Design a protein around this ligand. Structure first.
Ligand SMILES: [Zn+2]
Lengths: 214, 135, 133, 149, 100, 116, 54
RNA sequence: CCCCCGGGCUACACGCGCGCUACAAUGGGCGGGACAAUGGGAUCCGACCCCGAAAGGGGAAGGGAAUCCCCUAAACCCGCCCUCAGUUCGGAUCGCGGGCUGCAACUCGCCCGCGUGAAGCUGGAAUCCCUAGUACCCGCGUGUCAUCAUCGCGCGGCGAAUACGU
């Protein structure tokens, strides 16, 4: 029962989806600015371009990246939340419209509850959910170790976005809760730094394990 | 005006649900036949069950007793062309099982392929049983 | 006067006709303000919102599109409309703004489908049945 | 002011609401218990689906006419669930379409061409155009961008 | 009254041969001719398996027979018919004539 | 008592084939409409000559695609199964069934022990 | 008396199509009036004018 | 040796490979609104009209195919019912009836309607395919064909994430 003023929407200014602005959005993390693109656009849709060039993903809008991360099926070959999540025909794969709608409704709910800019909230969530330290196997002399290595911002972004989307999928699996409400809850919790956020929990866990085996 | 448990012929149906779906608790009535019967009777198939009058229940029972006389084409009934009478009919909970049983029993009696397969408990129609149909 | 222009996408071909008028835009006889879904409506209307009312309120565009799915049709119409507006205005500021926003408005897309190959020909060129003995 | 200037769903709604005065258009005997094609499983839930179907056929004859009854079957067909077998496409039934078109002709809204389907008359053209005019007069307040059309 | 001539062949050189012959035939005299008009090329494709047995990975040969098609209209004058019908057609080309 | 669609055997015996097909379940009806072959015609001749007088010998046939009619009720027909001629005493409840439904071609399997 | 050695005039089935060259029965390409087997066609195709052209 | 007539390769306590359908809301149903490409077509494709609830039946234009036909594809959008439940999830299995091809449908064929409503609540050890219009998802053509596609070979629709290494 969507009203017509929202079914047939026509933007006037150049904003994200015609509703939300960016010129007031700030980024404090000095390591993530050059990779969080906030250029004014209406349609956050790039038709596969920028993927062949190594560093081309920095020219993609952050909202489009969130949409593409959300356009998933779940955890297929690994376990998340304690279960496999294989839908395989009930999945929104190769369907960007449904992801568009999910993100739209999520941003609406965020605006309603917080009464702030949902893009600002997403930026805060990313910054608070991005990890700084990881592990890896390094060999010297002929034996195997487990060392502590730093992380690049272009990878921190991927980690954060993936974790947010996975938390949403978990919270939506087999429950009266919807994918949009789950995404909104996850983003708000990650922005407010609450332990009930999958992304923040994973960040803390990774950093702890690295500080341990460093 | 709400009956949490309504007593239609032989069966007790739920009230919180719509009539077209409550009537499916009976054996022999699907959603389609139920919609047919409710439309012939003049009852809203989306109404909550339990908001049913004795008059309504009686009309439903009569239609079930013989639907073809109240409309209900001869091609929308479970047993068109009865073996020993013709007389297109629609059987419900009690007589449906007897009809199945007597069909299978006459097959077994005349000793036909389908009856032998029924006895042995094996697929009857056309299937291959090497790789599947394993208990 | 009148101008005609074309645009192409994967298996979709659009042709647009522009002249002077009030600001009516029609794709396959129907207005653009009620095109569905939203994600194609915006695709088609981005160039007009870029140019502005002070240019679109003096022209009438009609587009005829054929082939290749609704998103592809929308993109082809977008390309054709941008090219027609640029050729009608003969202004360089608009062309520069378009090239900055997205160079594929005026330039086209050169991507087609790869032929399929014989292991699982139905699925694709690089896809094949598994081996899990 | 024409059909092409408003959405199809709202128009079909407003035309089904209006086709009820016309007495030549009424559901047949086998309508209350029947499916719309093999590709379906359950009957229509609405008790006034006949008028919606008739209005849709009317608008389709307007748009694409001349058109006979085998392409409307394709338009009204769809995708069937075949159990454990994969899904396929199947066309719909023709009796609904024949009855609808005959009722419309009796009312004087369409006529048949000798060899190419059926077309609308001026009497029917006026019907659609006036209903669309009313609907657009109602809409162009919610979306003022429709006034210039 | 006009005459239409359809040419089909696997070899393009023979097609060009006959078409330029009739083009000179029609230019020597002053007569209106349209074309030659190229029609879509038609391909007979046949995919089949190589091995005469069932063992080994499967491999496929894809054979194709191509047919090119040209159309011509000649305006059907007496002199044109006379000096057209007298052209030896190379056996690798089929030609069919008829008046509208 | 026996009644096929509300008809007794005395009544069935005096109806025409065009009337009995109306009762059969559409596959035997299609068969009878399309017609009978010379093999089935010869078998019918045998049956009719046997039910009264001349033929006093066993009736053997390879015809398994023949439908049981009312004028055959009361006889015994030997049907080929691939190896031998199985006897079949035709009763009333058989009406409308193929003759091969009562002569199996395989044996009930009694399994053993899986090997190596 | 001499007719128990002749086949029947089949109109449909795999026994209604022999190969003009070898005599096989089952696999017949049968496209555009080709009554040849998949084994002989692959050997006589160039003589008929087919090429690869891929 | 080779030609007919009937059976079998379709038999089933079990072990395995490659797949289809599912375990639901990133959905099921009802009614409306859209949008392709490759290929094929003589007793072959068949528009158009009339019968029938459906499967289907009776006439019949045009087409030897840039002219006519197969052919208004599905996923997708809108509104209404359902709201976390062996369920309006899921379809196995079985009864009655109606049909088409074929000389012949029991063994042993495909389709339609009304009923019936089995396991299945995301899956151990282990293992597989994929770097761009590619993979996942969606449906059409053709080969085999009298009738029969969960197959092979191809066609398009929507459309990513990561690495530019060892
Ligand atoms: Zn050969």
């Amino acid at each position: 029962a969507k009203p017509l003023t929202e079914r047939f929407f026509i933007p006037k200014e150049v904003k994200v989806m015609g509703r939300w602005s960016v010129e007031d959005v700030t980024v404090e993390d000095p390591s993530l600015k050059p990779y969080i693109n906030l250029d004014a656009r209406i349609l956050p849709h790039s038709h596969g371009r920028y993927a062949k060039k190594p560093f081309g993903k920095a020219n993609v809008h952050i909202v489009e990246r969130l949409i593409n991360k959300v356009m998933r099926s779940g955890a297929s070959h690994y376990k998340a939340g304690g279960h496999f999540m294989r839908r395989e025909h009930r999945s929104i794969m190769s369907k960007k419209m449904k992801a568009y709608e999910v993100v739209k409704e999520a941003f609406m709910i965020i605006e309603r509850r917080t009464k702030q800019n949902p893009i600002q909230v997403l930026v805060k969530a990313i910054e608070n959910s991005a990890p700084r330290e990881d592990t890896t196997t390094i060999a010297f002399g002929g034996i195997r170790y487990h060392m502590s290595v730093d992380v690049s911002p272009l990878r921190r972004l991927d980690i954060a976005l993936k974790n947010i989307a996975l938390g949403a999928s978990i919270k939506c699996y087999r429950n009266k809760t919807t994918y949009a409400q789950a995404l909104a809850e996850e983003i708000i919790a990650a922005a407010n730094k609450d332990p009930k956020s999958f992304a923040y929990s994973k960040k803390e866990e990774i950093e702890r394990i690295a500080q341990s085996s460093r | 005006n709400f009956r949490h448990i309504v007593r239609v012929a032989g069966v007790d149906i739920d009230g919180h649900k719509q009539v077209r779906w409550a009537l499916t608790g009976i054996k022999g009535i699907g959603i389609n036949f139920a919609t047919m019967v409710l439309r012939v009777a003049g009852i809203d198939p989306f109404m909550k069950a339990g908001y049913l009058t004795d008059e309504q229940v009686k009309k439903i029972e009569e239609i079930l007793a013989d639907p073809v006389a109240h409309g209900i084409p001869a091609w929308a009934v479970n047993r068109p062309k009865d073996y020993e009478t013709g007389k297109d009919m629609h059987l419900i909970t009690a007589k449906l099982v007897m009809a199945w049983r007597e069909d299978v029993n006459r097959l077994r009696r005349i000793r036909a392929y389908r009856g032998i397969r029924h006895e042995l408990g094996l697929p009857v129609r056309g299937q291959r049983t090497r790789s599947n149909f394993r208990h | 006067r009148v101008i005609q222009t074309a645009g192409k996408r994967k298996t979709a071909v659009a042709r647009a006709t522009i002249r002077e008028g009030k600001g009516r835009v029609r794709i396959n006889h129907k207005p653009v303000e009620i095109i569905e879904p939203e994600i194609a409506r915006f695709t088609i209307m981005e160039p007009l919102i870029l140019a502005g009312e002070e240019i679109v309120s003096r022209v009438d565009i009609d587009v005829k599109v054929e082939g290749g799915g609704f998103m592809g049709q929308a993109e082809a119409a977008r390309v054709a409309i941008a090219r027609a507006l640029v050729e009608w205005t003969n202004d360089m500021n608009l062309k520069e703004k378009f090239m900055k926003y997205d160079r594929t408005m005026l330039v086209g897309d050169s991507r087609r489908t790869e032929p399929h190959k014989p292991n699982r020909s139905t699925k694709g060129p690089r896809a094949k049945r598994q081996k899990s003995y | 002011a024409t059909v092409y200037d408003v959405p199809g769903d709202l128009l079909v709604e407003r035309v089904a609401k209006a086709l009820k005065e016309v007495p030549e258009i009424k559901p047949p005997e086998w309508a209350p218990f029947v499916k719309t094609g093999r590709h379906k499983e359950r009957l229509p839930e609405q008790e006034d689906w006949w008028y919606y179907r008739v209005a849709s056929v009317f608008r389709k004859v307007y748009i694409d006419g001349p058109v006979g009854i085998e392409r409307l079957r394709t338009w009204y067909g769809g995708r069937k669930n075949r159990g454990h077998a994969p899904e396929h496409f199947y066309k719909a039934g023709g009796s609904i379409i024949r009855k609808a078109l005959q009722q419309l002709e009796a009312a004087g809204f369409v006529q048949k061409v000798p060899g190419e389907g059926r077309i609308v008359t001026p009497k029917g053209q006026s019907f659609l155009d006036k209903i669309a005019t009313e609907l657009k007069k109602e809409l162009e307040e919610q979306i003022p961008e429709l006034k210039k059309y | 009254q006009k005459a239409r001539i359809k040419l089909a062949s696997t070899n393009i050189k023979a097609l060009n041969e006959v078409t330029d012959q009739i083009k000179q035939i029609a230019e020597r005299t002053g007569v209106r001719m349209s074309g030659p008009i190229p029609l879509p090329t038609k391909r007979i494709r046949i995919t089949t398996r190589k091995s005469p047995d069932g063992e080994g990975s499967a491999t496929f040969d894809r054979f194709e027979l191509r047919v090119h098609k040209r159309l011509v209209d000649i305006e059907a004058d007496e002199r044109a018919m006379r000096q057209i019908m007298r052209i030896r057609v190379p056996e690798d080309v089929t030609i069919e004539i008829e008046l509208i | 008592e026996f009644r096929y669609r509300g008809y007794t055997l005395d009544e069935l015996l005096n109806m025409s084939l065009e009337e009995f097909a109306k009762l059969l379940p559409s596959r035997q009806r299609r068969s009878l409409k399309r017609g009978l072959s010379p093999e089935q015609k010869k078998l019918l001749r045998k049956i009719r000559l046997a039910k009264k007088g001349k033929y006093n010998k066993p009736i053997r046939t390879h015809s398994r695609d023949m439908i049981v009619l009312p004028e055959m009720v009361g006889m015994t027909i030997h049907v080929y199964n691939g190896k031998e001629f199985v006897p079949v005493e035709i009763k009333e409840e058989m009406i409308g069934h193929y003759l091969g439904e009562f002569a199996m071609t395989r044996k009930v399997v009694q399994h053993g022990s899986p090997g190596v | 008396k001499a007719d128990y050695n002749k086949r029947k005039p089949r109109k449909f089935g795999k026994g209604a199509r022999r190969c003009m060259r070898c005599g096989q029965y089952g696999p017949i390409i049968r496209i555009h009036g080709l009554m040849l087997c998949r084994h002989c066609f692959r050997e006589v195709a160039p003589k008929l004018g087919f090429k690869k052209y891929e």
